[PDB]
Design a protein around this ligand. Structure first.
Ligand SMILES: *[C@@H]1O[C@H](CO)[C@@H](O)[C@H](O)[C@H]1NC(C)=O
Lengths: 49, 49, 98
């Protein structure tokens, strides 16, 4: 992983995004969403991520 | 339609959409026509009586 | 007959009433495109993204703005209606006396 001052960015496009595999995971200590509910992500479409 | 939700009657449109155009808009900023993401058919959206 | 058929402004008084009413409705409808501080002007886009407590905050902003827009419309219509009533009363008087 990158240092925070030199953070990495990856563009994601043209694909199917399953967000429930991440949200329903027991391995993450923090999972916070803004401007959107974490339980509605699978019903949405975006231009880029 | 690709995350665009609403209620209404869908019919074949006579609107001459250009190949790059995906949907039409009214003055109320609502969608009144869409291109179907699978058939690329243009449909008119009319509110239910 | 010849004057009316060649004078575009002859019936301006009646056209002005039609134009003012059409303008008022167009304004009222266009206000539905305003966010009023919300993330979106479209209720369906808010409801499809946010959960109840978050959606309610955004919806309240739209209700406040849209209610104000509608109150403005009605007030203006009441004022214009009073003007038209006065005109109609004058027309009725002229019908009787002229
Ligand atoms: C998939 O979408 C393409 C257009 O992008 C269309 O030509 C094709 O027929 C669709 N396939 C199915 C099974 O609908």
């Amino acid at each position: 992983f990158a240092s925070v001052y030199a953070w990495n960015r990856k563009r994601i496009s043209n694909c199917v995004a399953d967000y429930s595999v991440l949200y329903n995971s027991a391995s993450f200590s923090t999972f916070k969403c803004y401007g959107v509910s974490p339980t509605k992500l699978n019903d949405l479409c975006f231009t880029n991520v | 339609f690709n995350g665009l939700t609403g209620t209404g009657v869908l019919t074949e449109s006579n609107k001459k959409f250009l190949p790059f155009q995906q949907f039409g808009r009214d003055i109320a900023d609502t969608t009144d026509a869409v291109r179907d993401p699978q058939t690329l058919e243009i449909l008119d959206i009319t509110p239910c009586s | 007959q010849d004057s009316l058929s060649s004078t575009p402004s002859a019936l301006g008084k009646l056209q002005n009433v039609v134009n003012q009413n059409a303008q008022a409705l167009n304004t009222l409808v266009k206000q539905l495109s305003s966010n009023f501080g919300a993330i979106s002007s479209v209720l369906n886009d808010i409801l499809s993204r946010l959960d109840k407590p978050e959606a309610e905050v955004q919806i309240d902003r739209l209700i406040t703005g849209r209610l104000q827009s509608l109150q403005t419309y009605v007030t203006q219509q009441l004022i214009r209606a009073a003007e038209i009533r006065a005109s109609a009363n004058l027309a009725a008087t002229k019908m009787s006396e002229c």
